[PDB]
């Protein structure tokens, strides 16, 4: 399976599944700075799934590793902002992270395999 471009639609489909997950609700749009006026004191680089989808659709990711770095930032920002590891939003983040990591592993493996095949000779 040596298609160098296949990751893009695989990531589109995975984002569609994440948007259907009730657990993505806190993370579908940029964090509410009116509700959380201290947010930017703690979070240097806000990230959300709508920003990830728009970056993908703009053609502004070169690899699935770059998309994976932005998705992981959503999960670290939620951890950086939680007052407790027993919070509803952080708890949703941990389940969604597990789901994402389970699904992204084959996308990354296939892509890196395809690049190695392209450079084989
Ligand atoms: O406002 C948010 N997101 C939103 C929701 C609806 C509309 C616009 C934006 N948030 C709150 C801050 N976040 C946290 O990860 C967190 C952990 C503990 C408390 O919040 C991210 C989601």
Swiss-Prot record:
Disulfide bonds: none
Functional description taken from the UniProt entry: Probable regulator of the insulin and insulin-like growth factor signaling pathways. Stimulates cell proliferation through regulation of cyclin transcription and has an anti-apoptotic activity through AKT1 phosphorylation and activation. Plays a role in the regulation of cell morphology and cytoskeletal organization.
Domain of life: Eukaryota
Positions of modified residues (Phosphothreonine): 45
Subunit structure: Interacts with IRS1 and IRS2. Interacts (via bromo domain) with acetylated lysine residues on histone H1.4, histone H3 and H4 (in vitro).
Residue numbers bearing the Phosphoserine modification: 1, 91
Tissue: Expressed in myeloma and epidermoid carcinoma cell lines.
Domain Bromo: 2-107
Gene: PHIP
Source species of the chain: Homo sapiens
Compartments where located: Nucleus
Protein known as: PH-interacting protein
Disease: Chung-Jansen syndrome: An autosomal dominant disorder characterized by developmental delay, intellectual disability, autistic features, anxiety, hypotonia, obesity, and dysmorphic features.
Location of this fragment in the whole protein: 1315 to 1435 of 1821
């Amino acid at each position: 399976s040596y298609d160098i471009q296949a990751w893009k639609k695989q990531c589109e489909e995975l984002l569609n599944l994440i948007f259907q997950c009730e657990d993505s609700e806190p993370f579908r749009q940029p964090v509410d700075l009116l509700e959380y006026p201290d947010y930017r004191d703690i979070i240097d680089t806000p990230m959300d799934f709508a920003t990830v989808r728009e970056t993908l659709e703009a053609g502004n990711y070169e690899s699935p590793m770059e998309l994976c770095k932005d998705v992981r930032l959503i999960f670290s920002n939620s951890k950086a902002y939680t007052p407790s590891k027993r919070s509803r939003i952080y708890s949703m983040s941990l389940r969604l992270s597990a789901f994402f990591e389970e699904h992204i592993s084959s996308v990354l493996s296939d892509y890196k395999s395809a690049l190695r095949f392209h450079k084989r000779n």
